[PDB]
Design a protein around this ligand. Structure first.
Ligand SMILES: *[C@@H]1O[C@H](CO)[C@@H](O)[C@H](O)[C@H]1NC(C)=O
Ligand SMILES: *[C@@H]1O[C@H](CO)[C@@H](O)[C@H](O)[C@H]1NC(C)=O
Length: 192
């Protein structure tokens, strides 16, 4: 009888660069006993440190998950009567990481833009925090006096200050956060 594959789980999530591993399983009914084998990118998966195969190839463990591990892994079952193929799929998430947060200067009575840029999957939300008083800015938000405004989209945010004052100087933090976690970095605004 032709091989018929069963899978407990077919879609999987993992987070990159955390030393995580996941195990895909593939079993098949059929006579004669179907032989199970796994493919990635169309090439047979051979056992090593990264890929662990157990239970006559019924279980595939991918170790030390990184972004490039994302995608389809194909389970093939074959016997003299025919073959069946099914895919397991791995979505790899990436925790937020701020990749750009520069220091800035401007002069009193001037204008300045603080820029924070972050990577991540999901795309992180960006929040700004003013060190001296711990006041936080999201969105969208603006200051009571209307001088400060936050605009941002797609994991990037600008904090814009109009009519700078000496007291605006000091540390500002960017916080990039997703369900996965968060990353915070600091820069320094010098009004001088
Ligand atoms: C994988 O993550 C996605 C996106 O958050 C979620 O919708 C899905 O249910 C997850 N799959 C799991 C863990 O079963
Ligand atoms: C901002 O803070 C000081 C300025 O003296 C410096 O040590 C630090 O590297 C600056 N940050 C950047 C990204 O230039």
């Amino acid at each position: 009888s032709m091989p018929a594959i069963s899978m407990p789980q077919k879609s999987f999530n993992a987070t990159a660069e955390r030393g995580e591993e996941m195990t895909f399983s593939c079993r098949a009914s059929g006579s004669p006993e179907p032989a199970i084998s796994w493919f990635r990118n169309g090439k047979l998966i051979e056992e090593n440190e990264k890929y662990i195969l157990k239970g006559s190839n019924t279980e595939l463990t991918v170790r030390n998950i990184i972004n490039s591990d994302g995608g389809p892994y194909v389970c093939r079952a074959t016997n003299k009567a025919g073959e069946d193929e099914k895919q397991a799929f791995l979505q790899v998430f990436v925790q937020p990481h701020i990749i750009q947060l520069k220091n800035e200067t401007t002069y009193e009575n001037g204008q300045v833009t603080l820029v924070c840029d972050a990577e991540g999957e999901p795309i992180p939300e960006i929040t700004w925090k003013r060190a001296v008083d711990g006041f936080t800015f999201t969105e969208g938000d603006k200051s009571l006096d209307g001088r400060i405004e936050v605009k941002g989209q797609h994991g990037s945010s600008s904090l814009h200050i109009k009519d700078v004052k000496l007291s605006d100087s000091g540390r500002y933090d960017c916080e990039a956060a997703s369900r996965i976690g968060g990353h915070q970095k600091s820069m320094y605004l010098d009004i001088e």
